[PDB]
């Protein structure tokens, strides 16, 4: 559940 809010799955 927890992660960096700035982390977007589409940006890999």
């Amino acid at each position: 559940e927890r992660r960096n809010e700035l982390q977007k799955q589409e940006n890999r």
Epitope: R2, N4, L6, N11
Partner: antibody, heavy 112, light 116 residues
Amino acid sequence: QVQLQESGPELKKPGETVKISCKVSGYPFTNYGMNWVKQAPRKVLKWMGWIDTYTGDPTYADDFKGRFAFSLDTSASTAYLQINNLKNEDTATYFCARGTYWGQGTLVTVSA
Amino acid sequence: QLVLTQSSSASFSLGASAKLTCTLSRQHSTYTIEWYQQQPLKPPKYVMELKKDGSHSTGDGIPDRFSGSSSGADRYLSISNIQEEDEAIYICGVGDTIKEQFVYVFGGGTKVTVLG
């Protein structure tokens, strides 16, 4: 209601060490990681890295290796930033940011 | 390299529409960016998330006159009927993950001046 409250301004001499806090309120602290951002007088925002607010695992940006350390007090919903062996170039406002919420900033002045 | 390109400054008359550009590098051109607003005696404020298809989602306390749009590697912040309170530096940001390693980058920012 969500608020990230940082410690007050700091005046340090070069070579000294500073510890900045960021008190999180209004959401579960361990749900989101905490980013640290530098805004030197130039005003350009610079990402310093982030820390997992459960594990305490930090990730530093390339420009912030060695002298910079991120720590927690999960019980207190507080994130810390410690800069060791201070330099004039460390004179900047430091932010803690969830991303969508930001702290008010902490001015660190490095002067003899 | 994960690079964002913006203008140094721009001016607009009160009531006009301001289009600001944030440009993703050749690679990463399909990436989602974030827009931040920074006013003189205040910390930065989250404005929105803007995806490659123009899809956007604003933050709290962000008026309806703020919207986004995209082309290819270009991400646009559109401010409709620009107000004098919208005078600020608008900064864009982008994240990237490699092998479970998160890295975030900010652009140089665009200083916005509202005339009239």
